[PDB]
Amino acid sequence: GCCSDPRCRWRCR
């Protein structure tokens, strides 16, 4: 998953 930064939290949210 890339939900670690504000530049890779696309589908994260």
| Ramachandran sector of residue 7 (left: φ over 0; alpha: ψ -120 to 50; beta: rest) | alpha
Q: Which two tokens stand for residue 2?
A: 């890339």
Question: Which technique was used to obtain these atomic coordinates?
Answer: NMR
- CB-based contact 8:2 (threshold 8 Å): yes
Compute the CA torsion angle 12, 2, 6, 9 (nearest 10 deg): -20
Query: What one-character DSSP code corresponds to residue 5?
Result: S
Rounded Cα distance, 11 and 13, in Å:
6
- The answer to whether 11 and 3 have CB atoms below 8 angstroms apart is no
